[PDB]
Amino acid sequence: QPEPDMITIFIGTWNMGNAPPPKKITSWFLSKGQGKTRDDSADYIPHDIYVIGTQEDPLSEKEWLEILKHSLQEITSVTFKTVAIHTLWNIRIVVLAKPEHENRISHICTDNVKTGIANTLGNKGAVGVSFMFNGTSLGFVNSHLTSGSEKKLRRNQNYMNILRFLALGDKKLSPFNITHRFTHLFWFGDLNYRVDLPTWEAETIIQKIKQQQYADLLSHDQLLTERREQKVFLHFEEEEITFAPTYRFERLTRDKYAYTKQKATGMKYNLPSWCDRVLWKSYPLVHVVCQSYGSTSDIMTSDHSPVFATFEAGVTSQFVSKNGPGTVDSQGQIEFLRCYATLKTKSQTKFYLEFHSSCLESFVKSQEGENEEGSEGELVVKFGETLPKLKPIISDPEYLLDQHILISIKSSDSDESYGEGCIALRLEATETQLPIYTPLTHHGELTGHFQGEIKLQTSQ
Ligand SMILES: O[C@@H]1CCN(Cc2ccc(Cl)cc2)C1
């Protein structure tokens, strides 16, 4: 049986509004309703992995697992295995996978982050799962962020706290947060960003939704506008939204949006909004294609509609040679030429680089670079030709071209990272000097750039 080079992943996010689900939720897992839907001809074909995020979930883990497994069985006639389940308060993540994948999946991690202090620590935060699928790392985050049209800043703070403090993936990647630890990172949930228009425009917004004219509404979506201004989800992708706002509906129909202020809302308006979202971040030049992104029309127990997204995701095999793992393959090397970091920091310390990759036996510290002043005020850290020669464990190009090098630039004084980035080894040529580039981030904020040239030698 050949190892896969592609899998499909189902991502679901549903704020259940503290109500039991109805008896049939199969439309969700079939990506049927509004938006980018899945072709009918695929209905009997199981996804490899199903990741279900819920918020305001009133069910026990046992109750929800039984509904999910029975749903997938009815659709596909496959009995899915449970990879992971993690619940913080009423926020839950379930990872199910085809039985054939049991022995491909390892290094299963779960964590949660609680957002807010005293007042605002009580019910919002995130849960997550990570694991290895053969040679590919996969991360999944389900977040319920702060509610309310006037709290978009709070939501961006909740996001930053979750990405800094969620402990998933390989703990040896100590300078790297979850936005660098995975080949593919899926981040979904009730992100609670709103359509930011005047309250007086509510009936006009509803009119626009009934005409399926979302363009004027999406131009005021806080997640898109905050993303555009690099305030949140920097370097993440989202598929185009072509489904109606998934919030806030009257229960037991989808014909009415309940937007008017009520005691039960703290006297806040809930203008129709795309609260419920799926975003992703994959390492450079890895295959990732969104094949569906939409909302169900027929599940009406909650004031939110379920959202589905499906993805084709590139995976690699667990490579073994005569040499690595357990030694270097002296036929392979990675060289860096004319490298310099540009940092936004106003500090003056010396900096050095760390290279981390599963293609290395362990991480590699460089010598200190030479600080110069950029023409526009920037700190430029010059490495020239001084960066070490990296010795991959395997030189076979079918392995090595599929790998990535994570880079941290660290202060000599404190050993704290000032920036993290990622370089693909999927080069246009081997044994050829080729430009490389990564933005650098720290706590998910842009802190600079790394650029130069690479020269990769494989056994070919
Ligand atoms: O090529 C990808 C696709 C677009 N990305 C840049 C971008 C990110 C967020 C927004 Cl809102 C708009 C544009 C980079």
Burial of 187 (0-12, 13-18, 19+ CB in 10 A): buried
337 Cβ below 6 A of ligand 1: no
How far apart are the C-alpha atoms of 93 and 95, rounded to whole Å? 7
Q: What per-residue string of b and e applies to 138-147 under the rule 16 or more CB within 10 Å gives b?
A: bbbbbbbbbb
**What 3-state DSSP class applies to 372?**
strand
**What 3-state DSSP class applies to 338?**
strand
Within 82-139, where are the H helices?
none
Candidate of 219, 227, 236 to mutate for ligand 1, largest count of ligand atoms within 8 Å of Cβ: 227
Q: Which of 59, 173, 178, 198 is nearest to 126 (CA)?
A: 178
What Rg do the C-alpha atoms of the chain give, in angstroms? Answer: 23
How far apart are the C-alpha atoms of 169 and 138, rounded to whole Å? 8
How far apart are the C-alpha atoms of 415 and 432, rounded to whole Å? 33
Are 111 and 167 contacting, i.e. CB atoms less than 8 angstroms apart?
yes
* Residue 135 alpha carbon to ligand 1 centre in Å: 28
Torsion of CA 104, 110, 115, 121, to 10 degrees: 150
**What 3-state DSSP class applies to 150?**
coil
Domain extent listing, the chain: 1-325, 326-460
What 8-state DSSP symbol labels residue 431? Answer: S
Are 23 and 17 contacting, i.e. CB atoms less than 8 angstroms apart?
no
Are 354 and 363 contacting, i.e. CB atoms less than 8 angstroms apart?
yes
What 8-state DSSP symbol labels residue 251? Answer: T
Pairing of strands 379-384, 333-343: antiparallel
Indicate which atom in ligand 1 lies nearest the CA of residue 235.
8
Alpha carbon nearest to ligand 1 atom 3, residue: 237
How far apart are the C-alpha atoms of 426 and 35, rounded to whole Å? 33
Assigned token pair, 445: 């904020």
What strands lie across the sheet with 49-55, from one edge to the other?
34-36, 288-295, 307-314, 6-15, 49-55, 91-97, 81-88
Q: Which residues contact 351 (CB under 8 A, 6 or more apart)?
A: 341, 343, 368, 369, 371, 381, 409, 410, 411, 412, 418
288 Cβ below 6 A of ligand 1: no
Indicate which atom in ligand 1 lies nearest the CA of residue 224.
11
How far apart are the C-alpha atoms of 183 and 287, rounded to whole Å? 10
How far apart are the C-alpha atoms of 197 and 389, rounded to whole Å? 55
Residue 410: C-alpha distances to residues 114, 255, 336 (Å): 28, 55, 18
Q: Which residues contact 153 (CB under 8 A, 6 or more apart)?
A: none
Helix (H) or strand (E) holding 263: none
- Strand segments (E) across 2-160: 6-15, 34-36, 49-55, 81-88, 91-97, 105-114, 125-133, 136-144
Residue 418: C-alpha distances to residues 261, 408, 440 (Å): 45, 7, 8
Alpha carbon nearest to ligand 1 atom 4, residue: 237
